[PDB]
Nucleic acid binder design. Structure first.
Ligand SMILES: Nc1nc2c(ncn2[C@H]2C[C@H](O)[C@@H](COP(=O)(O)NP(=O)(O)OP(=O)(O)O)O2)c(=O)[nH]1
Ligand SMILES: [Mg+2]
Ligand SMILES: [Mg+2]
Length: 756
DNA sequence: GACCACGGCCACA
DNA sequence: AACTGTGGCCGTGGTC
C-alpha cells in the first residue's frame, strides 16, 4: 500500500521515493528513471531545432533542454502535435519555462507547474491508500505554559501525552502520582523521551488535533531552544513546515501526519470546533475541558496537577479515537482523488477536483489546459444566472410531497454532452441547444466532463445499492462516506466549469447547465399543476413541495406516483424525477427557510435560526419547541405560552448564560475588515490584548447590559463573571428570541406584543 | 431620530 | 477558509 511519494536530489538528478507498507513492513522504493518534462506547442515543426537551444540559469548552473520528443495529444477534443520537453531536474522548469514561452516560435506551454512526485503518481498510474494493509497509529497532544501577553512558545511544554491501541500515557517533568504518568527531570528529557517512544513504536500515522498550526511549531521552537534533533521522520528528518494558503501544514517523512482539525471542520458542521465539542458530537459522551489559567496556576503552585494530567491523557485518548474513526474514511478520498492522504486531508475542494481532472486527462491523453493569467482571470469575472427559486406560499400546509431530480446538474451535463470540448464544435451532425443562452453542444463524441460524471454517478448508484445489503455497519459507514464523496466531487466538477482559476473553465457550459435546470424544473411544476391539480408550495433549484388542496394523504401520494410515471416518460436521458418523502405537515417561512414533519414524527428544519450557529441557544431552543408545538399537534396556544414563559425567564435573569452565547467566525485579517460587527469588535479587543486571531477562529460572545452599540457591550463568554456581569436581557428578548418566533407565529395573527 | 443601504455571516440546492 | 449561485437576516453608519 503506497503511503506517499517525494523526491531527493542525488548528484544533481531526481530520485523518486515511494513510501509504502507491504506485508506489515515499511518499505521505501527508489526510482531514478523518471524524467521531468512539460509540453510546448509550436507553429512549425522544424522550429524545434531552436527550441532545444534556449538555456537559462538556476544557481549559477546552466539549465538546458535535455531531450525533446514529438507526441500526439488531444486538446479541446481535437488531435494536436505537441513537443514533450525533458529536463534534468524538476527545479529547471521554473527557471526556464518563461524563456521557452518568450520564444516567438512557441504558442504556449502546458503542464509545467505540476509537482514532481504527484506527476510521478499520475504518470505511473499509482493510487495510494490501496489495499487491506492496516497501519499503526499514534496520537499525541501537548500541554503548554501560557501567560497572556507573551510571544509564541516562550513558556515551556509541561506534559506530552500519547495514545494508541495500548492505552494513553503522559510524560511530564513534575511529579504526579498516577498510573499513566511518567516523570522525567527536565523538559529536554521529556521531549527526548517522546522521541524515543515514537522511534520505538514506529507508527505509520501520527494523529494530532490542530498540530498543523500549534503542537508541531511549538515543539520546533522548544527543540531549537534546547538543542534537540526532532527526528520524528522515519528517515531521521524533522517535521517539514509547508504553506497551505493562509495556514501552515506539517509533514513527517516516512509517516502520515493526520491532523483531524481540517477533516472535522470540513466534514461536520458545529457551532464550535473544540476537541471537547468535536468528541461529544462524534461519540456522544462529554469531555471535561481544563483551561490554560487552571493549568498555569497548577504548575506554578504545584497543586491539583493530577487534574491537568487527566486532561492531557484524555486529550490524547480522544484524538486517538477520532483518528481511528476518521482515517479509513479519508483514505477513501485518497483513493478517489489519487493523491496522498496527507494531501487530500488538507487540500481544498477545488484542488481535489483539479487533481482528479488532471489524472483523468492523463488517462485519456488529453492535454491539460493552463491556469488563467491575470488578464484572463479578469475576463472570467463574469456573471451568469443560477437555479430557479420561487417565493413560498408562506404558512402551514398539510399532506405535502417533496419531488426532486436525481443529481440535476450532472445529469444535465451527461444528457446534453455539456463540456468545453463539445461547445460550438464545428462539423458535427447532432447538436443540443441550451435554453435562453443558446449554446450548442455536439453529441457525436462524448465529452470529457460527461464521461467522468457518468462513471461517477454510476459508481455512486452502485454504492447506494450495495448499502442496502451491507451487513457490517462499519462498511455501511464506509460506503455512505464514499457516496457522499462522489456526490460532492460531481457537484464540484460542475462548479469547476464556472470557477475563474479553474483549468477546465467554461462559463458557457455552466450557464447552459443552469438554464437547462431552470427549464426542466419549471416544466415539471407547470405539468404537475395544470394536468394533475397540484399546487406547488415551495420550489428550490432541483425539486419542489406540492399537495392537493384538500385531499387525503393517500390521494396526494397516488397522484404524485401517477405524475412521476408520466413526467419521467416525458423526461429525456439521465433526467429523472424522484419521490423523496411525504410529510404530514409543513411550515414555510420564506425562501430557504422552512420545516416539515413526516408520519413518524421526525422534524426536518431548513435555513431557520435553529440550525444556524450565529444565533443564541435560547432562541434556537425556543423556536424548536414552538415548531414542535405547531407540527406535532397544531397547539398554537402552547407555542404562545412557550414564548411568554421564555421571555419572562429572560426578563428575570433566570436563564443560564451558557444558552446565551453567540458564535460567529472571522473570515479575514482584522486589518481588512471594513465593517466591524460585534464579533469583530471582540476580536479586535482580543488582538489588542495580544491574543492570536486568524481567519478561522470562532468568537463566542455575550451581549451585556449597557450603552447602545452591541459590539461595545459584548465580551467573550470565558470572561463572563456572573458576580460582576449581567447579560442584556432586553437584547436577547426584543432581538433574538422574539424575532425568531415572530416570523413563524405571525401566520396565526400574533404580533410581537402578544408574545412578551 | 427615522430610515435605509450594505458589509458580513451562514445556510440551501 | 481557499468548485457556484441564491437567499435571509443583523449591526451599523450616515444622509437627510
Ligand atoms: N457548485 C456546487 N453546486 C451544488 C452543490 N450542491 C448542490 N449543487 C446543486 C447541483 C446539483 O445538481 C443540485 C442538486 O443538489 P443536490 O441536493 O445535492 N442533488 P443530489 O441528487 O445530488 O442529492 P442526493 O443524491 O443526496 O439526493 O444543487 C455544491 O455543493 N456545490
Ligand atoms: Mg435527489
Ligand atoms: Mg437536494
Amino acid at each position: 500500500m503506497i503511503l506517499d511519494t517525494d523526491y531527493i536530489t542525488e548528484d544533481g538528478k531526481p530520485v523518486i521515493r515511494i513510501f509504502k507498507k507491504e506485508n506489515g513492513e515499511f518499505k521505501i522504493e527508489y526510482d531514478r528513471t523518471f524524467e521531468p518534462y512539460f509540453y510546448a506547442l509550436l507553429k512549425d515543426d522544424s522550429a524545434i531545432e531552436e527550441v532545444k537551444k534556449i538555456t537559462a540559469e538556476r544557481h549559477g548552473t546552466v539549465v538546458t533542454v535535455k531531450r525533446v520528443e514529438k507526441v500526439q495529444k488531444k486538446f479541446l477534443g481535437r488531435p494536436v502535435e505537441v513537443w514533450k520537453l525533458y529536463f534534468t531536474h524538476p527545479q529547471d522548469q521554473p527557471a526556464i519555462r518563461d524563456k521557452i514561452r518568450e520564444h516567438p516560435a512557441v504558442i504556449d506551454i502546458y503542464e509545467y507547474d505540476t509537482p514532481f512526485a504527484k506527476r510521478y503518481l499520475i504518470d505511473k498510474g499509482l493510487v495510494p491508500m490501496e489495499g487491506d494493509e492496516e497501519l499503526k497509529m499514534l496520537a499525541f497532544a501537548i500541554a503548554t505554559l501560557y501567560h497572556e501577553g507573551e510571544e509564541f512558545a516562550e513558556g515551556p511544554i509541561l506534559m506530552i501525552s500519547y495514545a494508541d491501541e495500548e492505552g494513553a500515557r503522559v510524560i511530564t517533568w513534575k511529579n504526579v502520582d498516577l498510573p499513566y504518568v511518567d516523570v522525567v527531570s527536565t523538559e529536554r528529557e521529556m521531549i527526548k523521551r517522546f522521541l524515543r517512544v515514537v522511534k520505538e513504536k514506529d507508527p505509520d500515522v501520527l494523529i494530532t488535533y490542530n498540530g498543523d498550526n500549534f503542537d508541531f511549531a511549538y515543539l520546533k521552537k522548544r527543540c531549537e531552544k534546547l538543542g534537540i534533533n526532532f527526528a520524528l521522520g522515519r528517515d531521521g528528518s524533522e517535521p517539514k513546515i509547508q504553506r497551505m494558503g493562509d495556514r501552515f501544514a506539517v509533514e513527517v517523512k516516512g509517516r502520515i501526519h493526520f491532523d483531524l482539525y481540517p477533516v472535522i471542520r470540513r466534514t461536520i458542521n458545529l457551532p464550535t470546533y473544540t476537541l471537547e465539542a468535536v468528541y461529544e458530537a462524534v461519540f456522544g459522551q462529554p469531555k471535561e475541558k481544563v483551561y490554560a489559567e487552571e493549568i498555569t496556576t497548577a504548575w506554578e503552585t504545584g497543586e491539583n496537577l493530577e487534574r491537568v494530567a487527566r486532561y492531557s491523557m484524555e486529550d490524547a485518548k480522544v484524538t486517538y479515537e477520532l483518528g481511528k474513526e476518521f482515517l479509513p474514511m479519508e483514505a477513501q478520498l485518497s483513493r478517489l482523488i489519487g493523491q496522498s492522504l496527507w494531501d487530500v486531508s488538507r487540500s481544498s475542494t477545488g484542488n481535489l477536483v483539479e487533481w482528479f481532472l488532471l489524472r483523468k486527462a492523463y488517462e485519456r491523453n488529453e492535454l491539460a489546459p493552463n491556469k488563467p493569467d491575470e488578464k484572463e482571470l479578469a475576463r472570467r469575472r463574469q456573471k451568469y444566472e443560477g437555479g430557479y427559486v420561487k417565493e413560498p406560499e408562506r404558512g402551514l400546509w398539510e399532506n405535502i410531497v417533496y419531488l426532486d431530480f436525481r443529481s440535476l446538474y450532472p445529469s444535465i451535463i451527461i444528457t446534453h454532452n455539456v463540456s468545453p470540448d463539445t461547445l460550438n464544435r464545428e462539423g458535427c451532425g447532432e447538436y443540443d441547444v441550451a435554453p435562453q443562452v443558446g449554446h450548442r453542444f455536439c453529441k457525436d463524441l462524448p465529452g470529457f466532463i460527461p464521461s467522468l460524471l457518468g462513471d461517477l454517478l454510476e459508481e455512486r448508484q452502485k454504492i447506494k445499492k450495495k448499502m442496502k445489503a451491507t451487513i457490517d455497519p462499519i462498511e455501511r459507514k464506509l460506503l455512505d462516506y464514499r457516496q457522499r464523496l462522489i456526490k460532492i466531487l460531481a457537484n464540484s466538477v460542475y462548479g469547476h466549469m464556472g470557477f475563474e482559476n479553474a483549468r477546465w473553465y467554461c462559463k458557457e457550459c455552466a450557464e447552459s447547465v443552469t438554464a437547462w435546470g431552470r427549464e426542466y424544473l419549471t416544466m415539471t411544476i407547470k405539468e404537475i399543476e395544470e394536468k394533475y391539480g397540484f399546487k406547488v408550495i415551495y420550489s428550490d433549484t432541483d425539486g419542489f413541495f406540492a399537495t392537493i388542496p384538500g385531499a387525503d394523504a393517500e390521494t396526494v401520494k397516488k397522484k404524485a406516483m401517477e405524475f412521476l410515471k408520466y413526467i419521467n416518460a416525458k423526461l429525456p436521458g439521465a433526467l429523472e424525477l424522484e419521490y423523496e418523502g411525504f410529510y404530514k405537515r409543513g411550515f414555510f417561512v420564506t425562501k430557504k427557510k422552512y420545516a416539515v414533519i413526516d408520519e413518524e414524527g421526525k422534524i426536518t428544519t431548513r435555513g431557520l435560526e435553529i440550525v444556524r450557529r450565529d444565533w443564541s441557544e435560547i432562541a434556537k431552543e425556543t423556536q424548536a419547541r414552538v415548531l414542535e408545538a405547531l407540527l406535532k399537534d397544531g397547539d398554537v396556544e402552547k407555542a404562545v405560552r412557550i414564548v411568554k414563559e421564555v421571555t419572562e425567564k429572560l426578563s428575570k435573569y433566570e436563564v443560564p448564560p451558557e444558552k446565551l452565547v453567540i458564535h460567529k467566525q472571522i473570515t479575514r485579517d482584522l486589518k481588512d475588515y471594513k465593517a466591524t460587527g460585534p464579533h469583530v469588535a471582540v476580536a479586535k479587543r482580543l488582538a489588542a490584548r495580544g491574543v492570536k486571531i486568524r481567519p478561522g477562529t470562532v468568537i463566542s460572545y455575550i451581549v451585556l447590559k449597557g450603552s447602545g452599540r452591541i459590539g461595545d457591550r459584548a465580551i467573550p463568554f470565558d470572561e463572563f463573571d456572573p458576580t460582576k456581569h449581567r447579560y442584556d436581557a432586553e437584547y436577547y428578548i426584543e432581538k433574538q428570541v422574539l424575532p425568531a418566533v415572530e416570523r413563524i407565529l405571525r401566520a396565526f395573527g400574533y404580533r410581537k406584543e402578544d408574545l412578551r
